[PDB]
Amino acid sequence: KCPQPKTLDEFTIIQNLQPQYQFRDYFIATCKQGYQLIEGNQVLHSFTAVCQDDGTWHRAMPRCKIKDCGQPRNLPNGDFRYTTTMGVNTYKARIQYYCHEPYYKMQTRARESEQGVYTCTAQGIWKNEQKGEKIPRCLPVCGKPVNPVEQRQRIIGGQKAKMGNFPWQVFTNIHGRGGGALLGDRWILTAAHTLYPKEASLDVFLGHTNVEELMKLGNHPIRRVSVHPDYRQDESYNFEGDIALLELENSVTLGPNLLPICLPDNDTFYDLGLMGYVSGFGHDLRFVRLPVANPQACENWLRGKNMDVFSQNMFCAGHPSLKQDACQGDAGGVFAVRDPNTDRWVATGIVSWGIGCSRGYGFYTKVLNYVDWIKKEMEE
Amino acid sequence: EDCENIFHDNAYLLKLDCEAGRVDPVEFDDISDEEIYEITVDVGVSSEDQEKVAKIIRECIAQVSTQDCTKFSEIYDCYMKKKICNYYP
């Protein structure tokens, strides 16, 4: 005979409590949901005790302490808050994930509010109703700059760009001074002739309006460089397919000084008369607004002077009566137009071939026809 | 010559927006002394020349009575006849 096994706490379950235990006989001890065997400070997967000759069990009764899911996983570009008792990771504890708005945005599924609610389940892992152990995903917003340019334009115009007006503008110094825009937190959109000129150390800078500061803000190395196959480096007259993407070695942490730019979705952004900003450098970032011109009035002006390659994948912007220079934009930079409905900034064009860098119209690369190619290289 | 051409281009972009129906002409006649301060100090005027540029702005907004899309031209000419760009870099 040996004593009736009594539990130390309350969460312990004695499987099949036999009225008395003789020699050779045994019992086992399990826990309830969300509880585990301990014995001191260890963690047991199972407990058994035999009735060892005299009235003793060969190992003392364990205790079922509460399971601890541990410190929740860090949400990239996001964070979380405890909805239950703060700092408690034990069973029946819940947390609320959230992304660093307005820079990143948690992906939805249609489904909200309860989207970033993870709880400490009985298996010791943070799960959810919809979706199991996988954590949410903070996605960057394309347009929506923190400090958008003023829409009330004045005759007393200030052509100096401030911090946040163009958070997507980047600076490249490959074969010469250049630039482009940001797509997401990893991809750079620019023109192909800044990579393969018609006549390489890459060097990509971004995140500020001062040229001296952009270089102080560190370099951004590149992995793959996808140039559109329609671009011919040797043909020093045709910039067909003047578009390319640049994948950064590491993703960037977005902020008010650094945000992506949206891609065009419908062709209404190319209607005649739409106004678009182009930003560029010299020693500081300047911006000018230019109207998209008649695609036919630009060809008559073009052929009327001397033959170029105005195609449907291209469009022209500017006006002759303007006193600015035709080379007022910056090479590889994007033709930034804002949708007055959704108040987002789309990159409808890319600074490509500007004939006669003195005065007249300016030609760009129509991004809309190349969006499907851009989404292909990025998703890979 | 930079200031002159830049103001010409801004006024003519405003005239294009007027022709498209994106900007009301009467709205351009409304600017506060605070907004004039901001626009003049951001582009870099002398703090002493601030009130003089403001006088020029008010006098040129008043001199024009044509509330059509051409006012942006006329006001500009006034800005050039009052020599506003001598106050600007």
Author numbering:
A (entry chain C): 308 to 417, 420 to 508, 515 to 597, 605 to 628, 630 to 703
B (entry chain A): 24 to 112
Which text from the study accompanies this structure?
We found that SALO inhibits the CP by binding specifically to the zymogen form of C1r. We provide two crystal structure determinations and supporting functional studies which show that SALO binds tightly to the zymogen activation loop of C1r preventing cleavage of its scissile bond. However, since the C1r zymogen undergoes autoactivation over time, we expressed an engineered fragment of human C1r consisting of its two CCP repeats and its serine protease domain, wherein the catalytic serine (S654) had been mutated to alanine (zC1r-12SP).
To further investigate this modification, we crystallized the eSALO-Y51F mutant with zC1r-12SP, collected X-ray diffraction data extending to 3.1 Å limiting resolution, and solved the structure by molecular replacement. After completing model building and refinement, our final model had Rwork and Rfree values of 23.1% and 27.8%, respectively. Although the contributions from the sulfate modification were expectedly absent, many of the interactions present in the WT structure were maintained. This included the hydrogen bonds formed by D32 and the salt bridges formed by E58 but not the hydrogen bonds formed by N33. Overall, these structures showed that sulfation of SALO Y51 promoted interactions with residues sharing the scissile bond of the C1r zymogen, but that sulfation was not necessary for SALO binding to the C1r zymogen. At the functional level, this modification appeared to result in an ∼8-fold gain in affinity for the C1r zymogen and an ∼170-fold gain in potency in CP-dependent hemolytic assays, as judged by comparison of eSALO-WT and eSALO-Y51F.
